[PDB]
């Protein structure tokens, strides 16, 4: 019912000229805690995006900036792995002519 899968990770400071040629692939996570808080505690309360800032074209490894409001510790895992290319401008401007 749909094509677009935002997935819950967005992506913050994303420079238009640059794109990603997939969406960032799923993956699991590892925590450690009450079922107390677990149980209660909600997805939508979790801090989870990416900064494309600074970094250039081509894969590199990245750590999320991840944060809890409450007592949880971050186990393990996981890390990122993607490609970052540049826009495929259709409209042609740079080099005079061609």
Same mark, same amino acid.
């Given at each position: 019912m749909k094509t677009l899968y935002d997935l819950p990770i967005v992506l913050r400071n994303l420079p238009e000229d640059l794109?990603? %040629?997939?969406?960032?692939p799923e993956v699991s996570v590892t925590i450690r805690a009450? $079922?107390?808080?677990l149980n209660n505690l909600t997805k939508e309360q &979790?801090?989870? !995006?990416?900064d494309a800032t600074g970094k =250039?074209?081509? %894969?590199?490894?990245?750590?999320?900036? !991840?944060?809890?409001?409450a007592g &949880? %510790?971050?186990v393990? &895992? $996981?890390?990122?792995?993607?490609?970052?290319? =540049?826009?495929?401008?259709?409209?042609? @401007? @740079?080099?005079?002519? @061609?």
């Open positions: 794109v990603l %040629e997939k969406p960032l009450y $079922p107390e808080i &979790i801090s989870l !995006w990416i =250039a074209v081509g %894969e590199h490894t990245v750590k999320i900036y !991840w944060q809890l409001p &949880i %510790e971050m393990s &895992i $996981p890390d990122v792995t993607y490609t970052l290319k =540049a826009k495929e401008d259709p409209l042609e @401007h @740079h080099h005079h002519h @061609h």
